[PDB]
Design a protein around this motif. Structure first.
Motif, mmCIF file in Angstrom:
data_model
loop_
_atom_site.group_PDB
_atom_site.id
_atom_site.type_symbol
_atom_site.label_atom_id
_atom_site.label_comp_id
_atom_site.label_asym_id
_atom_site.label_seq_id
_atom_site.Cartn_x
_atom_site.Cartn_y
_atom_site.Cartn_z
ATOM 1 N N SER A 201 0.831 -1.205 0.000
ATOM 2 C CA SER A 201 0.000 0.000 0.000
ATOM 3 C C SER A 201 0.865 1.254 0.000
ATOM 4 N N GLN A 202 0.667 2.102 -1.016
ATOM 5 C CA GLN A 202 1.328 3.408 -1.104
ATOM 6 C C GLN A 202 0.962 4.310 0.087
ATOM 7 N N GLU A 203 -0.256 4.148 0.616
ATOM 8 C CA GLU A 203 -0.815 5.005 1.662
ATOM 9 C C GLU A 203 -0.195 4.701 3.027
ATOM 10 N N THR A 204 -0.069 3.417 3.371
ATOM 11 C CA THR A 204 0.480 2.983 4.664
ATOM 12 C C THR A 204 1.991 2.752 4.622
ATOM 13 N N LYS A 205 2.582 2.665 3.420
ATOM 14 C CA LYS A 205 3.980 2.274 3.176
ATOM 15 C C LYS A 205 4.331 0.910 3.776
ATOM 16 N N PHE C 80 1.964 8.310 3.091
ATOM 17 C CA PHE C 80 1.865 8.470 1.650
ATOM 18 C C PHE C 80 2.406 9.835 1.186
ATOM 19 N N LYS C 133 -3.993 8.821 -0.414
ATOM 20 C CA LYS C 133 -3.596 7.569 -1.059
ATOM 21 C C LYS C 133 -4.699 7.078 -1.995
#
Lengths: 365, 37, 365
Positions: A201-205, C80, C133
């Motif tokens: 996930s790009q959002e949570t890394k 993100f 995100k």
């Protein structure tokens, strides 16, 4: 033990004499993997061998006049048509087909058999987990994970006419060098082992399991260390990774005294006379070739690769320089100290490691 | 000069009506002063 | 009703006189949105205005000598960092910053205020749903959904210095024309409205909610139809979409007799003397500007866009050609028939629609 020994003997015979590239040997190989096979006459000069399974269909076009394979096509019966079976070469407009290359560039069926075993593995273990989709997308998720974690690694699919996700570093000459290969293997130890879909996930890394209902059984995601090869072997602290994640431990079988060349270098007085070597390792060094990186272990990819890179740039070069016939050199698991002159650790940037080795080489020369 | 002052007072009227009635009355008195002059 | 009227008056005043671009007016605008703001002196010539919220930090560099904004930086406190705040222009190596452009290319703060209200909306409603995100990834999922559904639509982010996902068609001259804008808006009707994360799965070729635990409350995903503008308005059958998904119905307020120009064209005898027009619509035509496409309604994007495209290519051109001063022309909701000569329907390809209009134009001219 008879079945396991027989399977091991059959694997050995398949690897030892792959057979010549002929239509008959290709048909026999496909039938030996349980693939359905038929031959069609497309023309007086062209025959097609079509082979099929649950998801995969492979068409092999054979020129009867030239005694040569003309084309090879992969078709999937999945809702996913975008499976990359081409080699990733930067700057060639002709995507070279792995299956066609394995039958035209090699003297034997070994390359084709290995690629077909990989496709058959994805076919057998794909269901609602589609392993063709997931394995394609995984290469993008790993590439993103390295961008977000500031890791100087390049991700390529399909290197040297072989299926796999290849992780490359820049070498000393700006040449890309493979560090590791990621691929799927059958889990010989536990047929009940649940393999889940993990997305970066790009959002949570972070890696996340979005669909705990989407699993396959009896498959593992394997990270294999690509040795450029005893001095080119990568050695790990015994406690660096949980022993349950170690698929292939190179047991130095008990009749050749090959300590890690590192440990023989703590025992053998043939040093550069300018260096007093001090060992501060708390653990034994083990040679590991393959890791299970399935499920929650996908975070370990960056840690394993940093160790592999640090071991190549720092440890192996320090050992090469000390071994070629007084400053104290302390060597530990994660740090190296040359008296009060220079130090580097595993968590420093590659530029700090290179500067440490340059200074160390200037002193030892 | 009355033109820029009228502009500015106009804009903090239209930006912040949620100011208490004291500020609104005082600022309107200020505009009445500027147009009186 | 006093609060709703006061808020409507405040929105009207904010839109009617956005203020001049000055450091003081930018600070006042940010404070009016509840953003924390401070000013730092970077040099004798440069001051920075930094504004912050829960997730967003915006640095605005101001040149005291030139009386001009020099730079604008967005930083997220989310895991993100990859939020695209640049305009997507094909072929310019300089990604033009939306926030900087909104303060340098426009005469007033209106462009900057609208972009800041959008960022503040994402900030306020992001938590475990990260809307920065999700909104970034949604543009990729929509692009994929169109590839898998064979829809000839292009997806771009951030067009004309405005935040949004823009859906473009090829126009008659090969020029890209915006059809719709997708963005997030506050749900004024229901603060308890649950907005979930929906991912387009390549494997299932469907929208899926992977994490029903990841929701935000009081936000809707809006699809706005970009009219090129009464003949350029898009009209929909009243029963085409559930009335609950209609955010903005253009009520022709009861003091100007603007029927759909389509319905006035069934009432007014000023036709091309070669055509007998027959209306076979079963429903009333309504003008819809905004749709709620949240949650399970993401499948409707392709249907709405096909209607918008068919209405522009077929319906609007048929109306233009009939309205310019005997063959029977039957016009229905999803099909148009010109006697026994030519027909087209909503489910035909764009190439069939163009051929129908060419033939219709050749007969009517």
């Amino acid at each position: 033990s008879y079945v396991e020994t027989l399977d091991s003997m059959i694997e050995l015979f398949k690897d030892y004499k792959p057979g010549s590239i002929t239509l008959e040997n290709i048909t026999r190989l496909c039938q030996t993997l349980g693939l359905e096979s038929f031959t069609e006459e497309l023309s007086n000069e062209l025959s097609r061998l079509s082979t099929a399974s649950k998801i995969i269909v492979i068409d092999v076009d054979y020129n009867k006049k030239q005694d040569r394979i003309q084309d090879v096509k992969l078709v999937l019966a999945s809702n996913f048509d975008n499976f990359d079976y081409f080699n990733q070469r930067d700057g060639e407009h002709e995507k070279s087909n792995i299956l066609l290359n394995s039958l035209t560039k090699y003297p034997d069926l070994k390359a084709f058999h290995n690629n077909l075993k990989f496709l058959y593995l994805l076919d057998a273990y794909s269901h609602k987990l589609d392993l063709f989709k997931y394995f394609t997308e995984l290469s993008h998720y790993i590439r993103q994970c390295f961008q977000d974690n500031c890791c100087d690694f390049k991700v390529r699919t399909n290197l040297n006419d072989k299926f796999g996700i290849y992780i490359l570093t820049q070498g000393i000459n700006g040449k890309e060098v493979p560090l590791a290969k990621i691929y799927l293997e059958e889990n010989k130890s536990d047929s009940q082992y649940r393999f889940y879909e993990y997305i970066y996930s790009q959002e949570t890394k972070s890696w996340i399991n979005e669909s705990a209902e989407n699993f396959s059984n009896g498959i593992s995601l394997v990270m294999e260390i690509v040795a450029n090869a005893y001095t080119d072997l990568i050695w790990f602290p015994e406690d660096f990774i949980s022993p349950e994640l170690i698929i292939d431990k190179v047991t130095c079988s008990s009749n050749s005294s090959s300590s890690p060349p590192i440990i023989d270098l703590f025992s053998n007085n043939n040093y550069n006379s300018r260096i007093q070597l001090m060992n501060d390792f708390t653990t034994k060094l083990i040679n590991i070739k393959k890791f299970d990186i399935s499920n929650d272990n996908l975070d370990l990819i960056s840690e394993i690769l940093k160790w592999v890179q640090w071991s190549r740039i720092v440890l192996q070069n320090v050992f090469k320089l000390v071994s070629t016939p007084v400053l104290q050199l302390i060597v530990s698991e994660d740090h190296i100290i040359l008296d009060t002159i220079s130090e580097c650790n595993l968590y420093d940037d590659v530029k700090c490691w290179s500067k440490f080795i340059e200074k160390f080489q200037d002193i030892v020369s | 000069e009355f033109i820029p002052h009228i502009f500015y007072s106009l804009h903090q009227i239209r930006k912040d009506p949620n100011n208490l009635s004291n500020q609104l009355e005082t600022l309107t008195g200020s505009i009445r002063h500027r147009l009186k002059l």
